[PDB]
Design a binder for these strands. Sequence first.
DNA 1: TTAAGTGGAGCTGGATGCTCTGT
DNA 2: TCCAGCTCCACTTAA
RNA 3: ACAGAG
Lengths: 42, 49, 209
Amino acid sequence: LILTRLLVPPLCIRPSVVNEDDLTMKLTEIIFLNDVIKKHRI
Amino acid sequence: DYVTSGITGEPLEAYIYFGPVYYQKLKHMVLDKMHARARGPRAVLTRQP
Amino acid sequence: DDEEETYRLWKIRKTIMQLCHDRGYLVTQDELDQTLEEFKAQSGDKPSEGRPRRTDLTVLVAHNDDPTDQMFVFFPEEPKVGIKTIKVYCQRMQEENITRALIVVQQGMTPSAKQSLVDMAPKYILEQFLQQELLINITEHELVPEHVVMTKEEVTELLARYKLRENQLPRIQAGDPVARYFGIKRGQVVKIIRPSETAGRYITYRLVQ
DNA sequence: TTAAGTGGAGCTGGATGCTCTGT
DNA sequence: TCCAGCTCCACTTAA
RNA sequence: ACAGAG
């Protein structure tokens, strides 16, 4: 129930010209904040 | 008015009301509304018309 | 008042007699037809009349199954009955070796007493009735059909005729007024005779659950 | 005196018609 | 804009 | 996002 890993859907779930779908921009922000947290620990 | 039938040539029994009434043509025309699809283009996300 | 109070003690007693008769307890023809002006003879107006222990019933034996299967009806006088009064009625019931009783409360019952009736014993089962429910025999109400508690040998034909399991029948709750009236328990089936718009009848069935 | 079961009051989250026809 | 569940809190009984 | 039509 507690998510330590997350699937990202196939590209046909979220087509390249909506340009990118809102799911794709949320997944960018998750990846960015994962880099922010990892750096601030160091 | 006393009106004669154009089909049979015999007169009509009832008198028919005759006059000029203003009539306005509306923008809704069947040529701009007839539509048919056999098969055709589809959406990218859901592969339905 | 006093005219109105005796009227209740006659109508309540009259309904309890019909309730005991419909459950299949031995009730005599003069108990069911006890008239108001005849009620005034054994117990009269309110100073002479006693509510807690004069109008009690115990003559009711289950004359079908066995004359030792017997049941009380009790009429408490305190509007909210505590566990003390329940324990009083329970030990009297313990002495007589009677296993069923009806308690007819006047306004209500306190929550800790209500919990006791669930767990005092499975072999000592007591049913709360409010007297405001007994002033009108619901089995004679025009919207209530005839209910008939089916025998196990008839339930086994119902389930054979349609090739059903029990849990596919429609349900009736044990908290239903007409389920309480007949005192039925989980896993009994009631036949219900609905009246048609015509002279005919439609028969339906329900499962207590 | 207090442990506890149940009333009454406020907070929260859900829902509100079917399509084409254009800018 | 209207309406069921969930939780907090006073209010008697009971030991 | 707004206007229409039935």
